[PDB]
């Protein structure tokens, strides 16, 4: 029916797990680019889905870092950048235990 923020975050979590499993990211330095690699293929690209994800709970609509927000008049790119920033913020919390699970996997 509709796509929420939790489904997008689960898809990004699955993509980050797949990137860690495939590319063999061992520390946070490689994971700083792996998180963007997982996030930029999981962001919605049908407009409706974007607004449905942004209209759901769990994710705020303001930038804690004003410099991370791009300087443009495209509103949908601003909301997509907010999605990317919130996804990076929420995945950096789980990055440590994902790294620990990968270390315990091998």
């Amino acid at each position: 029916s509709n796509m929420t923020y939790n489904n997008v975050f689960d898809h990004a979590y699955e993509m980050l797990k797949e990137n860690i499993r495939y590319d063999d990211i061992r520390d946070t330095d490689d994971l700083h680019d792996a998180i963007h690699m997982a996030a930029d293929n999981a962001v919605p690209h049908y407009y409706a889905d974007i607004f449905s994800v942004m209209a759901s709970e769990g994710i705020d609509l303001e930038f804690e870092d004003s410099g991370l927000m791009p300087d443009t008049k495209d509103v949908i790119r601003i909301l997509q950048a907010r999605i990317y920033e919130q996804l990076t913020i929420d995945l950096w919390e789980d990055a440590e235990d994902l790294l620990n699970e990968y270390l315990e996997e091998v």
């Binding site: 930029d40 049908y46 407009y47 495209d74 949908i76």
Partner: peptide
């Protein structure tokens, strides 16, 4: 090149809407 491909996909989606 990866940034330009992502930007072109976003441009196509905005031209869709």
């Amino acid at each position: 090149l990866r940034e330009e491909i992502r930007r072109a996909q976003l441009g196509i989606a905005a031209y869709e809407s």
